[PDB]
Enzyme design. Structure first.
Site, mmCIF file in Angstrom:
data_model
loop_
_atom_site.group_PDB
_atom_site.id
_atom_site.type_symbol
_atom_site.label_atom_id
_atom_site.label_comp_id
_atom_site.label_asym_id
_atom_site.label_seq_id
_atom_site.Cartn_x
_atom_site.Cartn_y
_atom_site.Cartn_z
ATOM 1 N N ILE A 1 -36.694 79.703 -1.809
ATOM 2 C CA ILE A 1 -36.810 78.774 -2.936
ATOM 3 C C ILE A 1 -35.454 78.277 -3.450
ATOM 4 O O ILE A 1 -35.369 77.665 -4.518
ATOM 5 C CB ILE A 1 -37.632 79.372 -4.106
ATOM 6 C CG1 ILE A 1 -37.018 80.692 -4.593
ATOM 7 C CG2 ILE A 1 -39.096 79.530 -3.707
ATOM 8 C CD1 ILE A 1 -37.360 81.042 -6.024
ATOM 9 N N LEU B 1 -38.101 83.768 -12.375
ATOM 10 C CA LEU B 1 -37.949 82.985 -13.599
ATOM 11 C C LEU B 1 -38.501 81.567 -13.481
ATOM 12 O O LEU B 1 -37.830 80.645 -12.999
ATOM 13 C CB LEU B 1 -36.507 83.024 -14.102
ATOM 14 C CG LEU B 1 -36.272 84.292 -14.924
ATOM 15 C CD1 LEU B 1 -34.896 84.877 -14.677
ATOM 16 C CD2 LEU B 1 -36.487 84.015 -16.402
ATOM 17 N N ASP C 1 -18.472 84.079 -14.270
ATOM 18 C CA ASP C 1 -19.155 82.912 -13.705
ATOM 19 C C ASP C 1 -20.177 82.276 -14.667
ATOM 20 O O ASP C 1 -21.326 82.017 -14.297
ATOM 21 C CB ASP C 1 -19.795 83.269 -12.355
ATOM 22 C CG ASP C 1 -19.990 82.054 -11.456
ATOM 23 O OD1 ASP C 1 -19.295 81.030 -11.651
ATOM 24 O OD2 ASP C 1 -20.845 82.130 -10.544
ATOM 25 N N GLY D 1 -22.884 88.640 -9.684
ATOM 26 C CA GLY D 1 -22.123 88.980 -8.482
ATOM 27 C C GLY D 1 -20.613 88.958 -8.641
ATOM 28 O O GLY D 1 -19.893 89.578 -7.854
HETATM 29 N N1 ANP Z 1 -34.836 85.382 -10.680
HETATM 30 C C1 ANP Z 1 -34.857 84.085 -10.291
HETATM 31 N N2 ANP Z 1 -35.957 83.316 -10.461
HETATM 32 C C2 ANP Z 1 -35.982 82.026 -10.070
HETATM 33 N N3 ANP Z 1 -34.940 81.394 -9.488
HETATM 34 C C3 ANP Z 1 -33.774 82.044 -9.257
HETATM 35 C C4 ANP Z 1 -33.670 83.462 -9.656
HETATM 36 N N4 ANP Z 1 -32.431 83.868 -9.323
HETATM 37 C C5 ANP Z 1 -31.797 82.805 -8.760
HETATM 38 N N5 ANP Z 1 -32.596 81.715 -8.716
HETATM 39 C C6 ANP Z 1 -32.217 80.379 -8.173
HETATM 40 O O1 ANP Z 1 -31.606 80.489 -6.881
HETATM 41 C C7 ANP Z 1 -30.467 79.625 -6.780
HETATM 42 C C8 ANP Z 1 -29.307 80.286 -6.033
HETATM 43 O O2 ANP Z 1 -29.176 81.670 -6.367
HETATM 44 P P1 ANP Z 1 -27.877 82.256 -7.123
HETATM 45 O O3 ANP Z 1 -28.279 83.589 -7.705
HETATM 46 O O4 ANP Z 1 -27.298 81.190 -8.025
HETATM 47 O O5 ANP Z 1 -26.827 82.528 -5.929
HETATM 48 P P2 ANP Z 1 -25.243 82.667 -6.218
HETATM 49 O O6 ANP Z 1 -24.735 81.289 -6.580
HETATM 50 O O7 ANP Z 1 -24.637 83.343 -5.012
HETATM 51 N N6 ANP Z 1 -25.016 83.723 -7.601
HETATM 52 P P3 ANP Z 1 -23.639 84.806 -7.682
HETATM 53 O O8 ANP Z 1 -22.904 84.568 -6.384
HETATM 54 O O9 ANP Z 1 -24.228 86.191 -7.806
HETATM 55 O O10 ANP Z 1 -22.873 84.363 -8.908
HETATM 56 C C9 ANP Z 1 -30.069 79.233 -8.198
HETATM 57 O O11 ANP Z 1 -29.887 77.815 -8.299
HETATM 58 C C10 ANP Z 1 -31.191 79.730 -9.097
HETATM 59 O O12 ANP Z 1 -31.780 78.665 -9.854
#
Ligand code: ANP
Ligand code: MG
Length: 293
Positions: A30, A101, A143, A163
């Site tokens: 997703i 979420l 972040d 993270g």
């Molecule tokens: N619990 C959740 N429920 C729904 N959508 C989510 C959830 N966690 C993350 N997402 C979506 O997934 C997308 C990418 O995941 P994300 O956690 O942002 O990876 P990331 O950028 O590597 N975070 P980080 O590296 O830990 O700072 C985001 O745009 C969120 O909107």
């Protein structure tokens, strides 16, 4: 590699044992981030939806940052923090089973519509409540941006993306590593100076500009050259303060202070008159994708 295997084994001891596919169904991607991908899944018995973050150990920038992805959510059970149910090691991937979420990220909202002060205050209150708990334990998020803020179907606001967390103490009072997204980065951090939790307060300041103006300052500029501008120029201002109440203005002026020492803390900001404008979760529901035509 001696590096990979040692890290794998360590992480194995940290996470819960087993494989979640023994109780989960229908893994469908997703969205993706910098660390790895996120997918929804269904609980066999319950039929309930959860979110699963999958992160490949072999494909990380700084592998040790993956400990945050488990530990932070586990240790900071909070109203405004995403609930983590479990964490597993599946082959060469880390899987974090967390609450799904429904309302999506804040980015979706700020990029499309303009929030009112009632709604902006409600977001800031949620984040500051989360941050005060983190800063109290000397944990910096590093972040903070609209992309890190997730919503529920009923308009509640939760902080995610742990993270990049780091921890200061009385022994190590400041961090000095360069992490976070270019535009939301604090000036002292960009200058590669020793920094504390004050960098989060700045980032929140940039996220207010996001909620008001729709963009972080210099967003149309390349990431590298934007950082130079943040490092050189005065604190960024709102486009026009004609329609901004002095409550918000004075609030933002405490966030975007150039000197970290003069910048406000989450504890202090939680008492700022502006946050009393914060509306109920219900006032945020109109802003979500489903309720827009
Ligand atoms: N619990 C959740 N429920 C729904 N959508 C989510 C959830 N966690 C993350 N997402 C979506 O997934 C997308 C990418 O995941 P994300 O956690 O942002 O990876 P990331 O950028 O590597 N975070 P980080 O590296 O830990 O700072 C985001 O745009 C969120 O909107
Ligand atoms: Mg992301």
């Amino acid at each position: 590699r001696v590096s990979h295997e040692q890290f794998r084994a360590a992480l194995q001891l940290v996470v819960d044992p087993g494989d979640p596919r023994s109780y989960l169904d229908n893994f469908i991607k997703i969205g993706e981030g910098s660390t790895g991908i996120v997918c929804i899944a269904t609980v066999r018995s319950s039929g309930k939806l959860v979110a699963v973050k999958k992160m490949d150990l072999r494909k990380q920038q700084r592998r040790e940052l993956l400990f945050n992805e488990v530990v932070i959510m586990r240790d900071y059970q909070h109203e405004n923090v995403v609930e983590m149910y479990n964490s597993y090691l599946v082959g060469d991937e880390l899987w974090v089973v967390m609450e799904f979420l429904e309302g999506g990220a804040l980015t979706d909202i700020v990029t499309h519509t303009r929030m009112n002060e009632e709604q902006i205050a409600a977001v800031c209150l949620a984040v500051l409540q989360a941050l005060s708990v983190l800063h109290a334990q000397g944990v910096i998020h590093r972040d903070i941006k609209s992309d890190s803020i997730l919503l529920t179907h009923d308009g509640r606001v939760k902080l995610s993306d742990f993270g990049f967390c780091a921890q200061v103490s009385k022994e190590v009072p400041r961090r000095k590593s360069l992490v976070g997204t270019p535009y939301w980065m604090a000036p002292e951090l960009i200058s590669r100076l020793p920094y504390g939790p004050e960098v989060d307060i700045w980032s929140l300041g940039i996220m207010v500009i996001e909620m008001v103006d729709g963009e972080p300052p210099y967003f149309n500029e390349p990431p590298l050259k934007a950082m130079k501008m943040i490092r050189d120029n005065l604190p960024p201002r709102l486009k026009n303060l004609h329609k901004v109440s002095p409550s918000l203005k004075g609030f933002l002026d405490r966030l975007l202070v150039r000197d970290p020492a003069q910048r406000a803390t989450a504890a202090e900001l939680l008492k700022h008159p502006f946050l009393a404008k914060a509306g109920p979760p219900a006032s945020i529901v109109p802003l979500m994708r489903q309720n827009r035509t």
